[PDB]
Design a protein around this ligand. Structure first.
Ligand SMILES: [Cl-]
Ligand SMILES: [Cl-]
Ligand code: NA
Length: 129
């Protein structure tokens, strides 16, 4: 599924991401825009043989099991394919674990390089929340 901007903002707010660990909603919407262009089915093969999955491009090296990243962890205890669903629950629940692990949203390279330090509230302007 390819989300609209305000559609995704409302879904993320319902799932408790607004101000989660101090990150306002616009941060999460900005991260999803540049990680996946709002597409739940996005996948990208990393260098090291791991793969990033879903709307927030969660990495199989640490966070999910895809059966083809030897020596990796599965800290969210999920198959990586669950992160491609039109229902974003699994992605949100795993993202909450990632952002809590000490490095905040710097875990997402596109957030660090394209959202951090910008007016991220622009990403939820005009939406019904
Ligand atoms: Cl915001
Ligand atoms: Cl933080
Ligand atoms: Na894994």
């Amino acid at each position: 599924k390819v989300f609209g901007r305000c559609e995704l903002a409302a879904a993320m707010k319902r799932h408790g991401l607004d101000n989660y660990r101090g990150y306002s909603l616009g941060n999460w919407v900005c991260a999803a825009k540049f990680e996946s262009n709002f597409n739940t089915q996005a996948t990208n093969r990393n260098t090291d043989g791991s793969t990033d999955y879903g709307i927030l491009q969660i990495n199989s090296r640490w966070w999910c099991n895809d059966g083809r990243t030897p020596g990796s962890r599965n800290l969210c205890n999920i198959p990586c394919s669950a992160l491609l669903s039109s229902d974003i629950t699994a992605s949100v629940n795993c993202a909450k674990k990632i952002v809590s692990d000490g490095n905040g949203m710097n875990a997402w390279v596109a957030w660090r390089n394209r959202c951090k330090g910008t007016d991220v509230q622009a990403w939820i302007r005009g939406c019904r929340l």
